[PDB]
Short mmCIF file of C-alpha atoms in Angstrom, two decimals:
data_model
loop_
_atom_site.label_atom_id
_atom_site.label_comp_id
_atom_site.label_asym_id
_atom_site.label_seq_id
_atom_site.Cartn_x
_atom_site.Cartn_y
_atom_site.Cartn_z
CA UNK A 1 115.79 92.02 131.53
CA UNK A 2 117.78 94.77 129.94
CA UNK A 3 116.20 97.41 127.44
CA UNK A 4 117.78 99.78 125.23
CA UNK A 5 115.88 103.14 123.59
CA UNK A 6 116.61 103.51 120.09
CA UNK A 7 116.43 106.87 117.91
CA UNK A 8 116.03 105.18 114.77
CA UNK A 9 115.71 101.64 113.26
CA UNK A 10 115.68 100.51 109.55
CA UNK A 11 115.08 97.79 106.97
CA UNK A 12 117.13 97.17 104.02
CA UNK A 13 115.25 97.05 100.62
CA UNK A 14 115.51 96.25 97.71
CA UNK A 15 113.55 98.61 94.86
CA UNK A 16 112.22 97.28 91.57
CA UNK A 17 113.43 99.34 88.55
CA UNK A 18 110.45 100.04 86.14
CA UNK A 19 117.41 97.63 91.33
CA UNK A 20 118.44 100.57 93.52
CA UNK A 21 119.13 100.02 97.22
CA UNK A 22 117.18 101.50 100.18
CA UNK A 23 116.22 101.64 103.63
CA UNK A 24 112.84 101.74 105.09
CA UNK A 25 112.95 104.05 107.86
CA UNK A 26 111.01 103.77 111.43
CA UNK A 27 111.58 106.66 113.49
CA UNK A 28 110.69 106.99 117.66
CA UNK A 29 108.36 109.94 117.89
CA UNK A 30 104.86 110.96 120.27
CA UNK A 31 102.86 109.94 117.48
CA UNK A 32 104.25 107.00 116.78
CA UNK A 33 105.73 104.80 119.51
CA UNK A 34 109.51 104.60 121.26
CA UNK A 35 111.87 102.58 119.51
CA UNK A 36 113.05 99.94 121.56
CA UNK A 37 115.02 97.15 121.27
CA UNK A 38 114.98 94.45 124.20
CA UNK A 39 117.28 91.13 125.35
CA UNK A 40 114.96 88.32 127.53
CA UNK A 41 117.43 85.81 130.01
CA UNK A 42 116.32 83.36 128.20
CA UNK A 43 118.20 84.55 125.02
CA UNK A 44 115.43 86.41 123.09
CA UNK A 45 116.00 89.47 120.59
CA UNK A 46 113.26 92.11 119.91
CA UNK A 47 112.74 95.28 118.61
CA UNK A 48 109.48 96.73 118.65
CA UNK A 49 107.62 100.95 118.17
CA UNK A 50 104.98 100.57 121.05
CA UNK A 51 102.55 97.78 120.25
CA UNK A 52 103.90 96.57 116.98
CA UNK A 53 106.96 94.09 116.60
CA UNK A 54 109.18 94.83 114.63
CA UNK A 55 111.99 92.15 115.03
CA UNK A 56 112.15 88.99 116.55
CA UNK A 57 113.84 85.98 117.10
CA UNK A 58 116.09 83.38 119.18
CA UNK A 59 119.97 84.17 119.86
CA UNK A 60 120.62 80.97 120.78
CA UNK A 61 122.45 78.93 118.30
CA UNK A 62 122.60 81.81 116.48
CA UNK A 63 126.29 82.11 115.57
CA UNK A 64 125.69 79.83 112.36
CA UNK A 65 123.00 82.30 110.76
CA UNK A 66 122.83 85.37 112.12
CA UNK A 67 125.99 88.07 111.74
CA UNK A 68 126.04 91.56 113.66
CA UNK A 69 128.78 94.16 113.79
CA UNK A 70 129.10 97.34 115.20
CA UNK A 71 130.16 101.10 114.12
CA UNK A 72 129.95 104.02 116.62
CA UNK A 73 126.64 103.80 117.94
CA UNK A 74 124.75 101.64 115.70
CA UNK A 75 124.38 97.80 115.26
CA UNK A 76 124.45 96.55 111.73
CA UNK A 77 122.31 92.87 111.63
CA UNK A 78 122.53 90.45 108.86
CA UNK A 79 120.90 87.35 108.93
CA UNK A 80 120.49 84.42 106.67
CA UNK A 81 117.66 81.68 106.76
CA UNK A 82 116.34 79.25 104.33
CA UNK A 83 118.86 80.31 102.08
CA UNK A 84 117.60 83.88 102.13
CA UNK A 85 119.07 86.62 103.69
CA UNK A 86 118.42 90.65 105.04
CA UNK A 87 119.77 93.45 106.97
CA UNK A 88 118.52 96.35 109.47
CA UNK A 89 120.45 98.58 111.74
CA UNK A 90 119.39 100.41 114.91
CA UNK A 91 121.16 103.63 116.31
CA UNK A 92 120.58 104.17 120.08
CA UNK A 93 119.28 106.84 121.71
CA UNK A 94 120.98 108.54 124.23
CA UNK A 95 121.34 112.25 125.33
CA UNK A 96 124.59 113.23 123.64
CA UNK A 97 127.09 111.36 121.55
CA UNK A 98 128.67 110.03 124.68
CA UNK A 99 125.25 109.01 126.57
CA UNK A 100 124.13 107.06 123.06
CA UNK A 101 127.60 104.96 122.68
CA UNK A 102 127.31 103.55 126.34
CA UNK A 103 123.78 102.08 125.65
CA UNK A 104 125.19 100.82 122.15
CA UNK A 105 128.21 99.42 124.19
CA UNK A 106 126.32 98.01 127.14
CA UNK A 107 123.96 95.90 124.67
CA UNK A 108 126.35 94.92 122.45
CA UNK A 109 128.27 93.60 125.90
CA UNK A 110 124.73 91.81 126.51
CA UNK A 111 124.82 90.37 123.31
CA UNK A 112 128.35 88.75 123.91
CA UNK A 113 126.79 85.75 125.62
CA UNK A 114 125.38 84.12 122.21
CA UNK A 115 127.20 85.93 119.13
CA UNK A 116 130.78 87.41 118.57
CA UNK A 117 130.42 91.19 117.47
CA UNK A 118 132.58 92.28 114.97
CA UNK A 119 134.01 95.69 116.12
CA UNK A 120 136.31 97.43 113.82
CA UNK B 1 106.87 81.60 111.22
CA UNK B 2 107.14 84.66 113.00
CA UNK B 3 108.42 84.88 116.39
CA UNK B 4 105.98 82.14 118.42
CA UNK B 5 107.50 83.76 121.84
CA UNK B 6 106.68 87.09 123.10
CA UNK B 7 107.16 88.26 126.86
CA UNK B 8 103.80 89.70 128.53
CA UNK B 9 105.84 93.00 129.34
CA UNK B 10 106.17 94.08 126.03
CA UNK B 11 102.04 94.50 125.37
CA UNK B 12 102.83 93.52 121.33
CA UNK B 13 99.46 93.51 119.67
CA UNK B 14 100.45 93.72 115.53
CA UNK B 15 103.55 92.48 114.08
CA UNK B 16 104.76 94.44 110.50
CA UNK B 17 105.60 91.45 108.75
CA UNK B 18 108.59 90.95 105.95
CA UNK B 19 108.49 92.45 102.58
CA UNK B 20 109.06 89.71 99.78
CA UNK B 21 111.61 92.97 98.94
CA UNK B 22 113.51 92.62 102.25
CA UNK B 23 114.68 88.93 101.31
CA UNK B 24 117.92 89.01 98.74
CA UNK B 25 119.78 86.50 97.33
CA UNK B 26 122.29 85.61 99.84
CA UNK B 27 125.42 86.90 98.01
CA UNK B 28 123.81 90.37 96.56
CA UNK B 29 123.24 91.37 100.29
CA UNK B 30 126.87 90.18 101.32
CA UNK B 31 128.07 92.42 98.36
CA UNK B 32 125.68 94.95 100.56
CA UNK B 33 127.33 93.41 103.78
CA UNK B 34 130.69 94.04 102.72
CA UNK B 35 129.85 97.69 102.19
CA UNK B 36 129.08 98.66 105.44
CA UNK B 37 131.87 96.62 106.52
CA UNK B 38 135.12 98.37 105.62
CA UNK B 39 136.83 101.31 107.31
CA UNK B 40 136.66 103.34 103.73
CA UNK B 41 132.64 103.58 104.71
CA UNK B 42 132.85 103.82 108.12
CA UNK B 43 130.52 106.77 108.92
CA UNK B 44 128.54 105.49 106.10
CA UNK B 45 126.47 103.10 108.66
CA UNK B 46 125.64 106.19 110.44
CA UNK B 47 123.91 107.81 107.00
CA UNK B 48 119.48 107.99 108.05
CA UNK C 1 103.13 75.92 154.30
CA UNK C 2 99.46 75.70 153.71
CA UNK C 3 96.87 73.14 154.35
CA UNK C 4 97.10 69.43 153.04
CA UNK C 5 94.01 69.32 151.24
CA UNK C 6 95.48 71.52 148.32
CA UNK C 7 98.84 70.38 146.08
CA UNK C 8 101.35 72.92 144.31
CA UNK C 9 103.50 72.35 141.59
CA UNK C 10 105.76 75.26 140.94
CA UNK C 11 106.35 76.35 137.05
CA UNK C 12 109.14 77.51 135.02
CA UNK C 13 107.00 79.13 132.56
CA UNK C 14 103.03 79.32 131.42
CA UNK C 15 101.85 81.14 128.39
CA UNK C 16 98.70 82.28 126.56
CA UNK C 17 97.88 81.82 122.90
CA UNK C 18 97.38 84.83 121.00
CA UNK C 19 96.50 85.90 117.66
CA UNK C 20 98.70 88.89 116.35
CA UNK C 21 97.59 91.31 113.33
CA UNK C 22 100.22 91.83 110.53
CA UNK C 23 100.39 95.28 109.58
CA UNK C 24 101.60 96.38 105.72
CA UNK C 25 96.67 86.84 111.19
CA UNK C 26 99.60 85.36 112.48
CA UNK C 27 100.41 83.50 116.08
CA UNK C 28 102.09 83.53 118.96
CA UNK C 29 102.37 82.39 122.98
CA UNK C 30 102.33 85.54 125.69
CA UNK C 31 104.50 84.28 127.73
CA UNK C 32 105.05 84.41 131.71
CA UNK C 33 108.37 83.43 132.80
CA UNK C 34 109.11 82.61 136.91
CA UNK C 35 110.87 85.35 137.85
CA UNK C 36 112.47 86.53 141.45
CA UNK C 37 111.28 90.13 140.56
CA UNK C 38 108.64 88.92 138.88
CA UNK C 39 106.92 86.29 141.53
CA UNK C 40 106.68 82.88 141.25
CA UNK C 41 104.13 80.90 139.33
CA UNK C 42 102.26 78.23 140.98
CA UNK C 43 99.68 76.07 139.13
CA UNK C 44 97.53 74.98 142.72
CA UNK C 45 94.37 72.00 142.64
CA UNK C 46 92.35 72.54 145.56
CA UNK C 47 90.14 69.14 146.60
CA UNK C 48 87.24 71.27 145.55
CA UNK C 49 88.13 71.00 141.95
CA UNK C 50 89.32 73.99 141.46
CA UNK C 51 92.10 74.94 139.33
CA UNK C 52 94.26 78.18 139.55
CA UNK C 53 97.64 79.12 138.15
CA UNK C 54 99.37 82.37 139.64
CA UNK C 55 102.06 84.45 140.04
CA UNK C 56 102.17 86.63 142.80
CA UNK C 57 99.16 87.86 144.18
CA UNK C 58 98.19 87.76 140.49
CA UNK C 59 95.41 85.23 139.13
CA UNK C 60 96.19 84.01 135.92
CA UNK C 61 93.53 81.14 135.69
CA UNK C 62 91.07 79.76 137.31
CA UNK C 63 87.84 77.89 136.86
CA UNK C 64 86.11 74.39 137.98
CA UNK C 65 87.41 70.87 136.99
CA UNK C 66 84.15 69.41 138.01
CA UNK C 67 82.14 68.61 134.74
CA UNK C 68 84.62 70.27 132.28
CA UNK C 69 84.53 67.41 129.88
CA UNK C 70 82.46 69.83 127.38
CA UNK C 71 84.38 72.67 127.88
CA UNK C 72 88.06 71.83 129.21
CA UNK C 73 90.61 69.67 127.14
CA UNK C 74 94.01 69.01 128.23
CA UNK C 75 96.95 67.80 126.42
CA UNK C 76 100.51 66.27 128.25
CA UNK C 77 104.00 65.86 126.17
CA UNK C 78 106.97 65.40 128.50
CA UNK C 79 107.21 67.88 131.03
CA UNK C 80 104.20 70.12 129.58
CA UNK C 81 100.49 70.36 129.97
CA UNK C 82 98.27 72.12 126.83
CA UNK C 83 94.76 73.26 128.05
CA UNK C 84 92.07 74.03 125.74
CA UNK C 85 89.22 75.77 126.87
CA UNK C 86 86.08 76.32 124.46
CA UNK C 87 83.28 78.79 126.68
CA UNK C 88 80.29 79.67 125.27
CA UNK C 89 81.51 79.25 121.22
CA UNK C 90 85.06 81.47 122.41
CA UNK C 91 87.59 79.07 122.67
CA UNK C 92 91.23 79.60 123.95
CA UNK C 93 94.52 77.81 124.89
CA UNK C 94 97.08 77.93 127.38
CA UNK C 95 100.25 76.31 128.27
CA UNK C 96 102.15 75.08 131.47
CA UNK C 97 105.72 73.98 131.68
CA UNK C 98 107.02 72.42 135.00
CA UNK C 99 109.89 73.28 136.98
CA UNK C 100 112.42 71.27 138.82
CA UNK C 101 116.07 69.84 139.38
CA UNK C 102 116.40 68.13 135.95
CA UNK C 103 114.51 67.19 133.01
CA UNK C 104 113.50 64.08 135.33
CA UNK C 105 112.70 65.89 138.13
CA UNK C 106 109.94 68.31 136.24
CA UNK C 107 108.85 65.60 134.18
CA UNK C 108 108.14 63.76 137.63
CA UNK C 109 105.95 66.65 139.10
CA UNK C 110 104.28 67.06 135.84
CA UNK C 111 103.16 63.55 136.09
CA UNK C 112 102.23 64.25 139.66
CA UNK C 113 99.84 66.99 138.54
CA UNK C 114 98.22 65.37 135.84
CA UNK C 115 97.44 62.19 137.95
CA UNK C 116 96.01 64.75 140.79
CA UNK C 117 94.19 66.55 137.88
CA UNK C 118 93.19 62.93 136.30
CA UNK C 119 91.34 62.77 139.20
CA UNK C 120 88.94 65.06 137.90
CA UNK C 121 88.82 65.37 134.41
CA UNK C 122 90.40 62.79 131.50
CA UNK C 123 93.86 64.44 129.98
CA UNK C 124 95.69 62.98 127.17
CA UNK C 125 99.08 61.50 126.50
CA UNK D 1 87.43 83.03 139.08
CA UNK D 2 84.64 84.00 141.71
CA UNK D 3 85.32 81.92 145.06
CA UNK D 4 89.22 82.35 145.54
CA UNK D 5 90.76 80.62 148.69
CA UNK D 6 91.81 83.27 151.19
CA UNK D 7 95.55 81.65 151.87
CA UNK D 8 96.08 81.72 148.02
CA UNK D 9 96.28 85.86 148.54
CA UNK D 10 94.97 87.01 145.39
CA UNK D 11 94.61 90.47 144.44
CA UNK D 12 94.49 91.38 141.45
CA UNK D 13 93.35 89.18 138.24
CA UNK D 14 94.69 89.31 134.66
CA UNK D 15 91.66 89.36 132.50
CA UNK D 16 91.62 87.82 128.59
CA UNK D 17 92.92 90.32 125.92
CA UNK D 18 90.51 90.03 122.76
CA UNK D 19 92.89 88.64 121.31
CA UNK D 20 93.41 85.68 123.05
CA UNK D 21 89.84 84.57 121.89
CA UNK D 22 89.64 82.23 118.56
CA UNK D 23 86.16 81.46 116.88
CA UNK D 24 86.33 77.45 117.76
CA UNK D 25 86.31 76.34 113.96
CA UNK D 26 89.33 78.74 114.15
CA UNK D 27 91.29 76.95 117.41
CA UNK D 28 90.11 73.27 116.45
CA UNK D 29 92.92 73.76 114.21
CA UNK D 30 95.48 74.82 116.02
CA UNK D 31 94.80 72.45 118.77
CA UNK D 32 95.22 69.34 116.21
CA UNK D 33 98.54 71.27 114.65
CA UNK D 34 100.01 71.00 118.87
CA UNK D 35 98.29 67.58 119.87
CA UNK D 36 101.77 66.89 118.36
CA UNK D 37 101.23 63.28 116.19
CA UNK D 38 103.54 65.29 113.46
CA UNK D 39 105.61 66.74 115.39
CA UNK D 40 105.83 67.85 119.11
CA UNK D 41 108.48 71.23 118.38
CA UNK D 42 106.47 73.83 118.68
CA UNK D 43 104.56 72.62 122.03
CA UNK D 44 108.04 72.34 123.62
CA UNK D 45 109.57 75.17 122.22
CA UNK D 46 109.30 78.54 124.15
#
């Protein structure tokens, strides 16, 4: 069981005109939860700001639906399901620039096991 | 549905579910995709 | 190595049903997972009729099979057991897969427990 | 449980969140969704 704490972590939307693109932002803070994304053996995905979830699914068998790549120190997602798909990115936390890109690196190591990461 | 697994360790009570406004057509986000993709917006990814 | 009157059957996982709230309800299993760090489940029928499952020095369940035919319904498919409990009008449901070599193997001690706990109480197929 | 075998060596208990408890008309219909007739995925699936 491998954790990673995450500064910031966002959901792509779409905005009726009355369309323009956005990202709802969730943000680790006292008042508000830690950001943190976590990998299960078994081959589970979650992200989650204390007791709320905010992601999850399977990795398994995952190469046909879901698509993540990497810049820096932040994982883009992508997936697609019932013909429907969606983004959100994560940017880890870490104490500098060069603390951050190790936990980045190390998870998106973890991830190897289930899905190629595009990295430039 | 959503996720019918959750490990005891994580203490999950509520779940934020998806916004109808999440889910695009599956070419519109892979414009989107694409975007974030190339090296001309590299840095881009790292906007908040 | 404990006495012959009680029977063991290791698990590979066991998990509690759970209703979640969406924020702006839906379901899911809490799940236990045998674990080296973690301790190892063990679902355990004394002759009593008595029922535990634990990991650890941790109870997890446990409750009477004698008379549970109002109360306690229990479900098999392949190598898992579904329990469904219904105290007082609160009602719950938990979850049991075995653990073994190969899909054969668990399967076998599944069927092991259930005739051990068919002793007791009726379970379906 | 109240009478706990001494070579089992329990000590501690986890007790039942809140939300693990359904009203019953509430679980009677989950139970009949897992009993599996239309299909046994989701009581296999973990």
């Amino acid at each position: 069981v491998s954790q990673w704490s995450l500064k910031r972590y966002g959901r792509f939307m779409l905005l009726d005109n009355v369309g323009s693109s956005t990202w709802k932002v969730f943000e680790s803070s006292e008042e508000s939860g830690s950001l943190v994304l976590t990998i299960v053996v078994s081959g589970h995905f979650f992200i989650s700001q204390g007791q709320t979830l905010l992601e999850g699914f399977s990795l398994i068998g995952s190469k046909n639906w879901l698509k993540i790549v990497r810049r820096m120190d932040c994982l883009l997602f992508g997936t697609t399901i019932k013909n429907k798909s969606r983004m959100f990115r994560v940017q880890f936390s870490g104490e500098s620039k060069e603390e951050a890109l190790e936990r980045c690196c190390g998870c998106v190591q973890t991830l190897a096991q289930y899905v190629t990461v595009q990295e430039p | 549905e959503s996720m019918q697994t959750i490990p005891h360790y994580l203490q999950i009570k509520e779940i934020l579910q998806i916004s109808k406004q999440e889910l695009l057509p599956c070419h519109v986000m892979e414009q989107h995709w694409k975007f974030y993709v190339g090296r001309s917006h590299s840095e881009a990814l790292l906007s908040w």
